[PDB]
PDB file of N, CA and C and ligand atoms in Angstrom:
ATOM      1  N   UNK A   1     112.526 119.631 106.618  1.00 22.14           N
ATOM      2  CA  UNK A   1     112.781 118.563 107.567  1.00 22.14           C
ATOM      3  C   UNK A   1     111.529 118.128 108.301  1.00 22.14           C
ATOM      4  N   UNK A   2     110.746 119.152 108.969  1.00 22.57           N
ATOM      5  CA  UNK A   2     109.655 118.923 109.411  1.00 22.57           C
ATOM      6  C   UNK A   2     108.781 118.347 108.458  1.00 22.57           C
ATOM      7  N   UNK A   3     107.818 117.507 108.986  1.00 20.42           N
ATOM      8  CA  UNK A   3     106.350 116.959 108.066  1.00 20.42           C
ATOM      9  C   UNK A   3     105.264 116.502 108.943  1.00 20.42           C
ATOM     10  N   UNK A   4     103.429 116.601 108.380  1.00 22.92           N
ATOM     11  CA  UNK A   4     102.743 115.964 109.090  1.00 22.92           C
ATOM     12  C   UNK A   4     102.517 114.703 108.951  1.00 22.92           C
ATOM     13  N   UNK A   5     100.800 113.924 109.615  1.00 25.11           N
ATOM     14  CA  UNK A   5     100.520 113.264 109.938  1.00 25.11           C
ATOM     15  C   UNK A   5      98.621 112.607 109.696  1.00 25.11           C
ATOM     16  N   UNK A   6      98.702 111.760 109.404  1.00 24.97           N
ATOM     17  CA  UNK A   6      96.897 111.957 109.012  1.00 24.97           C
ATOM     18  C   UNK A   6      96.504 110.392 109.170  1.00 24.97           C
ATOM     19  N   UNK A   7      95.209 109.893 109.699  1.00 27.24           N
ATOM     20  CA  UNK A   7      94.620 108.729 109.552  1.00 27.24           C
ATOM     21  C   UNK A   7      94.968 107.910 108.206  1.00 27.24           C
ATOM     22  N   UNK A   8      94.379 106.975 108.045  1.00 28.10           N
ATOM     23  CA  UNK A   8      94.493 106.324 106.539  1.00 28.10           C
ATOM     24  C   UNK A   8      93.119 105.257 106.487  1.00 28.10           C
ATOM     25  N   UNK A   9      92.382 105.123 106.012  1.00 27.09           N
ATOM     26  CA  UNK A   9      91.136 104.710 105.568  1.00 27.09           C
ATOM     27  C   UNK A   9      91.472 102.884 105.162  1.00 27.09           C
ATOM     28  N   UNK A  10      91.446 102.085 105.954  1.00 26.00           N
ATOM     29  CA  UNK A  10      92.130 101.027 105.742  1.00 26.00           C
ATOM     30  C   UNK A  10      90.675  99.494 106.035  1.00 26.00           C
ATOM     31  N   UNK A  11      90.669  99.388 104.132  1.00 27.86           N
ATOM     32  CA  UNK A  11      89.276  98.044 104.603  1.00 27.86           C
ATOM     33  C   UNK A  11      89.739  97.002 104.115  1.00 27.86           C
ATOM     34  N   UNK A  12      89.768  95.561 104.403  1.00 29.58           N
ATOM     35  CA  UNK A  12      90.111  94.536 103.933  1.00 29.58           C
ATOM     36  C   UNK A  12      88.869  93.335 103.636  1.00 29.58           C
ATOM     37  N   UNK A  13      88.772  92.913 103.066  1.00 25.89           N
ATOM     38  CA  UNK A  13      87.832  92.037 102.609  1.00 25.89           C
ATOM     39  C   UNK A  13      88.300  90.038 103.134  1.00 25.89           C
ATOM     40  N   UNK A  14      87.783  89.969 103.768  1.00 23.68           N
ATOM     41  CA  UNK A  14      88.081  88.368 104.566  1.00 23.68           C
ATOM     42  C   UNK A  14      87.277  87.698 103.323  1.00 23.68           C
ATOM     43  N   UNK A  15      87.450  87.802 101.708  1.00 22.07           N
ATOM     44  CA  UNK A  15      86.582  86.719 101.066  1.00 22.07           C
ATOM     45  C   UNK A  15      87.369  85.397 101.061  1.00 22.07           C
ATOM     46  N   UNK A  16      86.588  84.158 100.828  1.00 22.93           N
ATOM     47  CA  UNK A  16      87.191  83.119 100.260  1.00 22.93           C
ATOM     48  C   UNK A  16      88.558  83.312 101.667  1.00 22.93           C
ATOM     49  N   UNK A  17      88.744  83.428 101.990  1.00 24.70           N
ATOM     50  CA  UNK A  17      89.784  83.823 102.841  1.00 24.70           C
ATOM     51  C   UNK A  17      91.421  84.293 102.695  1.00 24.70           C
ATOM     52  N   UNK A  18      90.782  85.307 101.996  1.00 25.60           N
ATOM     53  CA  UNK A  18      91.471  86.138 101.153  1.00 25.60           C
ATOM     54  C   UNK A  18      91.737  87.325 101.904  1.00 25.60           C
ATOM     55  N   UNK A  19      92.999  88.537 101.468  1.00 30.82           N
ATOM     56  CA  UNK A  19      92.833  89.821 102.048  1.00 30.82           C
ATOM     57  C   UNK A  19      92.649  90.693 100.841  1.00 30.82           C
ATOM     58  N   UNK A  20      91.419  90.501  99.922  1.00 32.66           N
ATOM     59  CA  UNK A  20      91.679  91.489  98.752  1.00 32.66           C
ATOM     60  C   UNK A  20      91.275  92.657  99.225  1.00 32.66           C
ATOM     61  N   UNK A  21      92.909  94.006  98.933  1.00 32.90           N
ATOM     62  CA  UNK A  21      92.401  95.334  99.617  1.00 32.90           C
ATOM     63  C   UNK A  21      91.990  96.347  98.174  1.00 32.90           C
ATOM     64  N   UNK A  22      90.811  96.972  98.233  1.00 34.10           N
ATOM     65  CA  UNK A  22      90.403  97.951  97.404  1.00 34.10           C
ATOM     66  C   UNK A  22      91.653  98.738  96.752  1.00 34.10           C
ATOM     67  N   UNK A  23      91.696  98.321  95.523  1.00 33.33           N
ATOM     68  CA  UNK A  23      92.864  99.176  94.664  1.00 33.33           C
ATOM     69  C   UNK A  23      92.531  99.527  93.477  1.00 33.33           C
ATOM     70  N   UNK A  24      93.357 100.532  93.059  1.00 33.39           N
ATOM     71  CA  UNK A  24      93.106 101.295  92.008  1.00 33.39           C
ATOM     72  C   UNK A  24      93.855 101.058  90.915  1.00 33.39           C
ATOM     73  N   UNK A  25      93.506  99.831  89.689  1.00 29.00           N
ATOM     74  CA  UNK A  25      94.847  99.390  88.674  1.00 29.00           C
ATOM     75  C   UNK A  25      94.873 100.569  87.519  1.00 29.00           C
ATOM     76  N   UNK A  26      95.533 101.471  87.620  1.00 28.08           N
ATOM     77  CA  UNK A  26      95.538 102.348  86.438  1.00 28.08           C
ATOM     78  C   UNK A  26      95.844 101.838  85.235  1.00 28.08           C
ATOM     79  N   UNK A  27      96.469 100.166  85.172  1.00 27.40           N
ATOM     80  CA  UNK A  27      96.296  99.669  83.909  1.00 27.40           C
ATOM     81  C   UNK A  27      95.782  98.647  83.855  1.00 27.40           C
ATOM     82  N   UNK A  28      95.581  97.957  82.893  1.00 31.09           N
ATOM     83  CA  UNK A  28      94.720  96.830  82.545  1.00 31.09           C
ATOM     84  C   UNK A  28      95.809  95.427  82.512  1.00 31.09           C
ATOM     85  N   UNK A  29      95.106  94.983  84.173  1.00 33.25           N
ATOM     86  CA  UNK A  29      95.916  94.065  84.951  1.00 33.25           C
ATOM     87  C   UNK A  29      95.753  92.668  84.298  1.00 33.25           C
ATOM     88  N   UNK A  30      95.961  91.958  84.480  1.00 34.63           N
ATOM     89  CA  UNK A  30      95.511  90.589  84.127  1.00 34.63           C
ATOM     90  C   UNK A  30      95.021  89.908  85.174  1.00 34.63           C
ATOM     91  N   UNK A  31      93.437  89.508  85.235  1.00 34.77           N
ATOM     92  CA  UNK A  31      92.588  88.774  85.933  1.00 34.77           C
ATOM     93  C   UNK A  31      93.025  87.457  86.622  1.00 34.77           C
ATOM     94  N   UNK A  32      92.360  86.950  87.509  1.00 37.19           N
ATOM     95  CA  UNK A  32      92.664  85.843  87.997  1.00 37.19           C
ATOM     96  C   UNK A  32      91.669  84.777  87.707  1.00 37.19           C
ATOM     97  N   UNK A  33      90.720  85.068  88.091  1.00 36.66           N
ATOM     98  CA  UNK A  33      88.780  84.518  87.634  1.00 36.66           C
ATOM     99  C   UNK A  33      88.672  84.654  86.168  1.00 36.66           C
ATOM    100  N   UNK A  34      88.088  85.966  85.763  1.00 39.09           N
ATOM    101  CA  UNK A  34      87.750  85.714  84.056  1.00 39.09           C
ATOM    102  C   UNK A  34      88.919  85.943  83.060  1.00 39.09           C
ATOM    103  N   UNK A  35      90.194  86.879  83.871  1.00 37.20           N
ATOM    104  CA  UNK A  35      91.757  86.857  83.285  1.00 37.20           C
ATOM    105  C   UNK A  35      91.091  87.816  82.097  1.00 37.20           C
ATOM    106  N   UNK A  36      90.079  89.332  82.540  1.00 33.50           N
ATOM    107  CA  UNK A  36      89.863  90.129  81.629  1.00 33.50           C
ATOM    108  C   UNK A  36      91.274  91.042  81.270  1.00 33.50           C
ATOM    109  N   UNK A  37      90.848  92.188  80.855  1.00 34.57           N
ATOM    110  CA  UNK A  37      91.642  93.517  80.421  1.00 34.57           C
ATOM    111  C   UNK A  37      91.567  93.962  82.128  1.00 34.57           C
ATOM    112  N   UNK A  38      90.672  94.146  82.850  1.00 34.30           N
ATOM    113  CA  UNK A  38      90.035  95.163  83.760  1.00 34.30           C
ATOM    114  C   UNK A  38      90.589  96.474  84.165  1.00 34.30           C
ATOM    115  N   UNK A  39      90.089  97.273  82.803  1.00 32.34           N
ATOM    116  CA  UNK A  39      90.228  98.574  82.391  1.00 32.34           C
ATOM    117  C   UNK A  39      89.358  98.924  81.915  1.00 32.34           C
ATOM    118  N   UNK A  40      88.966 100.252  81.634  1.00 33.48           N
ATOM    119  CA  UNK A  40      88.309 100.687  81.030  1.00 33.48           C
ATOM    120  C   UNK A  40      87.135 101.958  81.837  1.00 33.48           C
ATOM    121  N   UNK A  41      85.863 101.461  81.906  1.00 32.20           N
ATOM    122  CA  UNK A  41      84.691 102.392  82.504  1.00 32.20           C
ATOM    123  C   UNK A  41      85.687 102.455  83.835  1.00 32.20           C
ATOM    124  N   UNK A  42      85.672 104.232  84.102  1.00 35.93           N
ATOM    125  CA  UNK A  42      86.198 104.547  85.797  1.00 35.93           C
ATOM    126  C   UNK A  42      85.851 103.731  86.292  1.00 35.93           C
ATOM    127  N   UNK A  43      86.373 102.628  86.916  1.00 34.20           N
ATOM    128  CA  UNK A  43      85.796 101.875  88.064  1.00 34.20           C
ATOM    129  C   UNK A  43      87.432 101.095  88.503  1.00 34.20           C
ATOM    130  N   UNK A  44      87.460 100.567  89.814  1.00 36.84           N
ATOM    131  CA  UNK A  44      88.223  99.838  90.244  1.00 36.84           C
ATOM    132  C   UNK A  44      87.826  98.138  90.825  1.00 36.84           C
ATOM    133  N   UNK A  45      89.358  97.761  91.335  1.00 38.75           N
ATOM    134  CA  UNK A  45      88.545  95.995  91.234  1.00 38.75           C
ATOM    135  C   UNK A  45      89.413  95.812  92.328  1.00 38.75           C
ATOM    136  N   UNK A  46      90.234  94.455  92.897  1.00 42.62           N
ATOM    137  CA  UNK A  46      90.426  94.140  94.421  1.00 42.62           C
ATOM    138  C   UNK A  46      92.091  93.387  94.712  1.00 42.62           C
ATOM    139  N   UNK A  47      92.619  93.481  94.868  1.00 43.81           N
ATOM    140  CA  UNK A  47      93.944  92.980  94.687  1.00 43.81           C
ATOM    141  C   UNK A  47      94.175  92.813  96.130  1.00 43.81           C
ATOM    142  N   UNK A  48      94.913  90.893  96.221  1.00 42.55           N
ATOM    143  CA  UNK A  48      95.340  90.631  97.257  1.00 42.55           C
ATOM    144  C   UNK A  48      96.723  91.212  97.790  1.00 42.55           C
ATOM    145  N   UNK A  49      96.632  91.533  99.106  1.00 43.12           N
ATOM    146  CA  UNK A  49      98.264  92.186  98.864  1.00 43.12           C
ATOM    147  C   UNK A  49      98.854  90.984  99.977  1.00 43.12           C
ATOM    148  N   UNK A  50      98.390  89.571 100.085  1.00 41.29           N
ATOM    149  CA  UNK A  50      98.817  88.760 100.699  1.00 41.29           C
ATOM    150  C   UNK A  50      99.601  87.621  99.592  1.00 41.29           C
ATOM    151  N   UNK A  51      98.920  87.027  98.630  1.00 42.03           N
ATOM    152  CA  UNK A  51      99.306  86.611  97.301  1.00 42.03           C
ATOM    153  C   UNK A  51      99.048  87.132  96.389  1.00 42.03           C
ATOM    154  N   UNK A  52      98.467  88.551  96.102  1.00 45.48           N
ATOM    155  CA  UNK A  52      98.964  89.559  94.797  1.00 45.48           C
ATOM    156  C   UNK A  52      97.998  88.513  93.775  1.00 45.48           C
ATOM    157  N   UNK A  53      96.664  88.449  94.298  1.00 46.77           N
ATOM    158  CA  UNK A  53      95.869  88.285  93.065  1.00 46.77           C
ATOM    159  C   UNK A  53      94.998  89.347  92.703  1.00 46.77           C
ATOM    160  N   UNK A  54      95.083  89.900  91.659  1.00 45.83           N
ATOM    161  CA  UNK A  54      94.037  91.035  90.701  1.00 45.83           C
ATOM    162  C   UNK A  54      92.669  90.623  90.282  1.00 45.83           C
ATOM    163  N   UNK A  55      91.750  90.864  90.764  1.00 45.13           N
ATOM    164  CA  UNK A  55      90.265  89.924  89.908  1.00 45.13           C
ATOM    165  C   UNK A  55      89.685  91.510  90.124  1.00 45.13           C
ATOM    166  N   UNK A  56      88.367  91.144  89.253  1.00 42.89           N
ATOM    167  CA  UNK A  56      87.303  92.413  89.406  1.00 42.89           C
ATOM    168  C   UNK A  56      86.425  92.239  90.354  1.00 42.89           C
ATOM    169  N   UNK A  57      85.992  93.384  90.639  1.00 43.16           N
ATOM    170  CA  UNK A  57      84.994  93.786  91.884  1.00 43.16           C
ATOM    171  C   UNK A  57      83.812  92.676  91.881  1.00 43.16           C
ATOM    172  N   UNK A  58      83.711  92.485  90.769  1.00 43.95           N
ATOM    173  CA  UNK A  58      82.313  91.349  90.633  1.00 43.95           C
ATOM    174  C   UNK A  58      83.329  89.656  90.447  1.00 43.95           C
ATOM    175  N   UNK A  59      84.274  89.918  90.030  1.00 45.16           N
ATOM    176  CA  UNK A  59      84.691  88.053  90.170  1.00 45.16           C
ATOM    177  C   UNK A  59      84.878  87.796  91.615  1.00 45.16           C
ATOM    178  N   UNK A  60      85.046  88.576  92.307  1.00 42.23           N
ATOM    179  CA  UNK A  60      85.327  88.479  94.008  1.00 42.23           C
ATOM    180  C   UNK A  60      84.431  87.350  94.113  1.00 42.23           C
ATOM    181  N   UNK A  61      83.030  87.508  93.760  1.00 40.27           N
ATOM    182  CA  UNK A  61      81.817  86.817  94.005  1.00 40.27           C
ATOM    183  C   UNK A  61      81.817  85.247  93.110  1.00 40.27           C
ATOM    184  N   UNK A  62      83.198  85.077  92.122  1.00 37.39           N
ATOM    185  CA  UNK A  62      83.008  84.531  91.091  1.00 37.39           C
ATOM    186  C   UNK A  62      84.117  82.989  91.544  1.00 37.39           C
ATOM    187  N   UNK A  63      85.398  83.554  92.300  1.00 37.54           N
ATOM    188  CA  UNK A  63      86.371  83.104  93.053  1.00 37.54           C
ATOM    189  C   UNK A  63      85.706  81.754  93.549  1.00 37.54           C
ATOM    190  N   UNK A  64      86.943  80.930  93.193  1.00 35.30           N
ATOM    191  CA  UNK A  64      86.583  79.232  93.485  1.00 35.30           C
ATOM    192  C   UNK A  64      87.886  78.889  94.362  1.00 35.30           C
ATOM    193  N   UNK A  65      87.919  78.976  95.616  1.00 32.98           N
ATOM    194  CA  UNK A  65      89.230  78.810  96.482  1.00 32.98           C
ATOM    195  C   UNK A  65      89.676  79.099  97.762  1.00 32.98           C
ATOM    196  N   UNK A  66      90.464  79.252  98.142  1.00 34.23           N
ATOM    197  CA  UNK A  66      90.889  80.001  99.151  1.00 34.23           C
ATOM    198  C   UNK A  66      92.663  80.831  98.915  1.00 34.23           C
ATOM    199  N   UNK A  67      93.007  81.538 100.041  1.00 35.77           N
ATOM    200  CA  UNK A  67      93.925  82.430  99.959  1.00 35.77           C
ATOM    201  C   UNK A  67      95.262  81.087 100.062  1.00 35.77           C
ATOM    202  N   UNK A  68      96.496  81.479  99.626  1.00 36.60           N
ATOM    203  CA  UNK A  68      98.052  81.110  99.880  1.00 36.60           C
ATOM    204  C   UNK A  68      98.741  81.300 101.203  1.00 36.60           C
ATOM    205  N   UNK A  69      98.934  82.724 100.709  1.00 33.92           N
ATOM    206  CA  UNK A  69      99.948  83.733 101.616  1.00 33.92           C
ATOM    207  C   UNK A  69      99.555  83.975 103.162  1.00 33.92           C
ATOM    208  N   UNK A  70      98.421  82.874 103.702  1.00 33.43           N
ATOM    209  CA  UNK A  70      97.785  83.336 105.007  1.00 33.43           C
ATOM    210  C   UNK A  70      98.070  82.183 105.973  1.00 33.43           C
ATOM    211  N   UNK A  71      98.381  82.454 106.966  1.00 33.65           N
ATOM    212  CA  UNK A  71      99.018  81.507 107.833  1.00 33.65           C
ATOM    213  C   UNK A  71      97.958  81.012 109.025  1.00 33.65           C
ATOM    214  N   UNK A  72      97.774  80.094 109.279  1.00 36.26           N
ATOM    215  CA  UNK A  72      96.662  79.792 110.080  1.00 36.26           C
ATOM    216  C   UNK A  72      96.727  77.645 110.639  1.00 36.26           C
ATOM    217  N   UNK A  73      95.905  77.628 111.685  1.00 34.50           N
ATOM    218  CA  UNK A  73      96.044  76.558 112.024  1.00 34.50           C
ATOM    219  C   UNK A  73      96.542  75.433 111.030  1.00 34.50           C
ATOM    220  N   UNK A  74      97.224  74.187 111.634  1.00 34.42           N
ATOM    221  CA  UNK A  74      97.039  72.847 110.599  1.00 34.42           C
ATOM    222  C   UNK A  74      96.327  71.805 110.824  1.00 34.42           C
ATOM    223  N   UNK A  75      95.124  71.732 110.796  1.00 38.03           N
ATOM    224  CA  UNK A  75      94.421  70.373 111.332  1.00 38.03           C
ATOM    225  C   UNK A  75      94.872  69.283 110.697  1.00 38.03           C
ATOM    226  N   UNK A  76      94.835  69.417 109.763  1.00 37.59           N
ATOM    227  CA  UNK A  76      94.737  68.049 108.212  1.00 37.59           C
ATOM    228  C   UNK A  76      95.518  68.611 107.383  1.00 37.59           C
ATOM    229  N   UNK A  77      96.655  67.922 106.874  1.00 36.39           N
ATOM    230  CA  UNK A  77      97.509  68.806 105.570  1.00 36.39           C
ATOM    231  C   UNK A  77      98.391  67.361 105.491  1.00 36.39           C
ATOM    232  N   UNK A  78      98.157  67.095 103.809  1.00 36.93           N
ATOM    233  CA  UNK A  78      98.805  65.867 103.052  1.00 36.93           C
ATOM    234  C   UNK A  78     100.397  66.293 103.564  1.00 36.93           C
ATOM    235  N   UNK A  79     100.653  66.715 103.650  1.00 36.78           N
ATOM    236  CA  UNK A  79     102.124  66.975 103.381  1.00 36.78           C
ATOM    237  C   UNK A  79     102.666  68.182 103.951  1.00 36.78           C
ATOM    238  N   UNK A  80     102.674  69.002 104.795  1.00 40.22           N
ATOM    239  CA  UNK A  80     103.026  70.517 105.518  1.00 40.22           C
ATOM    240  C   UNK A  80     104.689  70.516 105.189  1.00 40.22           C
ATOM    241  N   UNK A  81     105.142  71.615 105.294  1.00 40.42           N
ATOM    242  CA  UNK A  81     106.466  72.049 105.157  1.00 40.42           C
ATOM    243  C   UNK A  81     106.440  73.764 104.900  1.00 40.42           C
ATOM    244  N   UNK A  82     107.402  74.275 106.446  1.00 37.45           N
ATOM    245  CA  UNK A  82     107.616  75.490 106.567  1.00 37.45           C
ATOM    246  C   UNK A  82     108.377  75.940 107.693  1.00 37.45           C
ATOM    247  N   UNK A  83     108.708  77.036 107.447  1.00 37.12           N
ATOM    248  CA  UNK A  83     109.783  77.640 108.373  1.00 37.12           C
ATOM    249  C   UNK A  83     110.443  78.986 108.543  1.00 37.12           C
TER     250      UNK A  83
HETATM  251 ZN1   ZN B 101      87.935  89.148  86.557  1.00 37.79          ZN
HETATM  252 ZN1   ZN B 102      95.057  85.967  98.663  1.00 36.00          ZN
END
């Protein structure tokens, strides 16, 4: 019944204005930027957990856009709708 308690190591990346958080795809996800395998050599890559995009550690840098899922002022918008 009883259990503990511990910090958690928590970094987020503001790219493109994005929240891609450091993750670990144990399989070979499908890219967003080059839409690789990104599997293979131990290494990991960046997944938004705001709109759930997968790219590699180096397309971060490659990314032509901005984020969805992020809510923020409306100065200028053709058309807005939400609720
Ligand atoms: Zn990629
Ligand atoms: Zn995003």
């Amino acid at each position: 019944g009883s259990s503990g308690s511990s910090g958690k190591q928590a970094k987020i990346h503001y790219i493109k204005n994005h929240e891609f958080i450091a993750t670990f795809f144990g399989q070979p996800t499908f890219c967003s930027v080059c839409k690789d395998f990104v599997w293979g050599l131990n290494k990991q890559g960046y997944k938004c957990r705001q709109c759930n995009a997968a790219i590699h550690k180096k397309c971060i840098d490659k990314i032509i856009g901005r984020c969805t899922g992020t809510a923020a002022n409306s100065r200028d918008t053709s058309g807005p709708s939400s609720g």
